[PDB]
Design a protein around this nucleic acid. Structure first.
Ligand SMILES: [Zn+2]
Lengths: 120, 95, 116
RNA sequence: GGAGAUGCAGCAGAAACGACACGGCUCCGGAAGAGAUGACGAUGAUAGUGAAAGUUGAGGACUUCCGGAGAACCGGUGAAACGGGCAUCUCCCCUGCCCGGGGUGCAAGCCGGUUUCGGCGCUUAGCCGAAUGUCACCGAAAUUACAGAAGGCGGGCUAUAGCCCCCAUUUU
RNA sequence: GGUGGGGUUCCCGAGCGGCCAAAGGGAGCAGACUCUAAAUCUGCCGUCAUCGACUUCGAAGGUUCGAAUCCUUCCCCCACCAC
């Protein structure tokens, strides 16, 4: 007999998904403080459950203030790859600026191009 | 999915709710969704447009799931939902 | 596989490629597509499904969901690169002026039918 | 407030508490392609800024890799990072007050007795095989809830009966 | 009235803030073994009962990235005291 198929960490991951989806759904209405409360509760349950953030909702939030970042409204997203490949998220509310360095994927593409050169 | 057994640990925010019994007479008859949740308090926005502050331990709640309607005391919902999903065991005896 | 929202049929994918081939007045590269959907001059966004790293296009669809410009996906990036006019692949193409295929992008408004 | 030491597991990240080795940047050596050709380039090209960041966006265009050494800037991770935090322990830098320092504790300690007992400590209540009883009433603070002395006094914690005062939600 | 302490699996008992880390022993079940049985060994060991994963460390609150563990409170269990 199997009554409990869903464990504590599974319901924790479901609460992560539901809370951050409701954060996105409520952040577009005009209440950024309610969305900050959702991100704060999701971050508190992430540090409490010792579970990692999903890669979908990972870069959509700010670590300093906690505002859910709408790209374009209160978040400026620019891709610069002259010196090193990076995608920069800029919070318009407080001013915290984060980025996405892509050096090792460029290294993998570079090794694939070296293999295509040496085979040819 | 949200189950009637794990509704003691599922998140209450984002679910329609009505209360059926309470000691406050004017509390009976409200219908709305859950927005904010603290240790023994729900902040419920009515369909009419009024925000109400409902204590949990004085009333019983009927949560509307995907088709389901589950009646749970707020005495079972004691604690912040953070600590409630940590682990909260509540055993109630209405003698 | 992650940033994609809906499954794209192959026929409307070929319609997207034919629209990119017929337009030839476009913004290629994700920076110009992002600027075009922030300004609102773009009428159609085409995003490749095989983009690795995904972050280069991961800001693209939800922003369109904020701005109301119809966006759609193609499976290969090198085919979009050859349709845009380059020997090397392109991640995303925004269309400013369609021209002779303008009625065609009306059919790509049926992507909204795929949205529901 | 400062110094010194430890720890922030595992995974991830270049890196988990002092700074660093590492990759983007500069130089040198080797290999491969090439002079109206070809390599590369919207997963970004000659390209600039205090190079976190932002403006730029292509008959643009002379390149790419590996290994070694160095002035400045930068870390996809995580709660927390070329840099500031957290907690513990020990010292020295202050201000004011007080001078015997520790250890056991009244079932301590002392006496008749010399195993075992009685007396002092011991009471404006003072038992020890642990006394403080019952009813009515003024009042409304009352024997009703938690609940009982054991050498005494002072501080703090725990649990609530009756009235008074103060604060909050529903309400009108 | 007083001091030095302990509460973890059915019972006796360990355990650095960290992957059921939960040492374990005895017990139950199953395997193995034997003509049968004892002893020895192996897995479940609380549950699904093949790997593996989840819950319980007397109870509550709080600190923390995270509690058997660190702090506070509520408890109980020991040992010995009249001379
Ligand atoms: Zn902000």
């Amino acid at each position: 007999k199997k009554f409990l198929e869903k464990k504590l960490k599974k319901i924790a991951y479901e609460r992560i998904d539901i809370l951050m989806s409701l954060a996105e759904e409520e952040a577009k209405k005009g209440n950024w403080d309610r969305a900050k409360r959702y991100v704060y509760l999701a971050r508190r349950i992430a540090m409490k459950m010792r579970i990692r953030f999903p890669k979908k909702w990972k870069r959509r939030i700010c670590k300093k203030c906690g505002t859910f970042l709408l790209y374009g409204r209160n978040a400026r997203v620019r891709i610069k790859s002259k010196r090193y490949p990076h995608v920069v998220i800029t919070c318009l509310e407080c001013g915290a600026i984060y980025r996405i360095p892509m050096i090792r994927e460029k290294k993998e593409k570079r090794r694939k191009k070296l293999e295509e050169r040496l085979k040819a | 999915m949200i189950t009637p057994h794990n509704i003691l640990r599922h998140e209450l925010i984002g679910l329609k709710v009505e209360i059926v019994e309470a000691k406050n007479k004017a509390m009976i008859g409200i219908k709305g969704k859950v927005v904010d949740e603290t240790r023994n308090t729900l902040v419920i926005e009515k369909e009419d447009g009024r925000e109400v502050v409902i204590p949990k331990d004085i009333a019983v709640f009927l949560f509307q799931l995907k088709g389901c309607k589950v009646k749970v005391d707020g005495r079972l919902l004691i604690g912040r939902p953070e600590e409630r999903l940590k682990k909260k065991i509540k055993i109630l005896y209405p003698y | 596989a992650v940033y994609v929202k809906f499954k794209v049929p192959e026929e409307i994918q070929k319609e997207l490629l034919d629209a990119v081939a017929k337009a030839q007045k476009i913004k290629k590269g994700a920076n110009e597509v992002t600027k075009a959907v922030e300004r609102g001059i773009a009428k159609l966004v085409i995003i490749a499904e095989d983009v690795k790293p995904e972050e280069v296009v991961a800001h693209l669809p939800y922003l369109c969901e904020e701005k109301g410009i119809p966006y759609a996906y193609v499976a290969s990036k090198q085919d979009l690169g050859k349709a845009a006019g380059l020997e090397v692949a392109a991640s995303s193409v925004a269309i400013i002026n369609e021209g002779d295929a303008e009625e065609l992008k009306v059919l790509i408004e049926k992507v909204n039918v795929l949205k529901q």
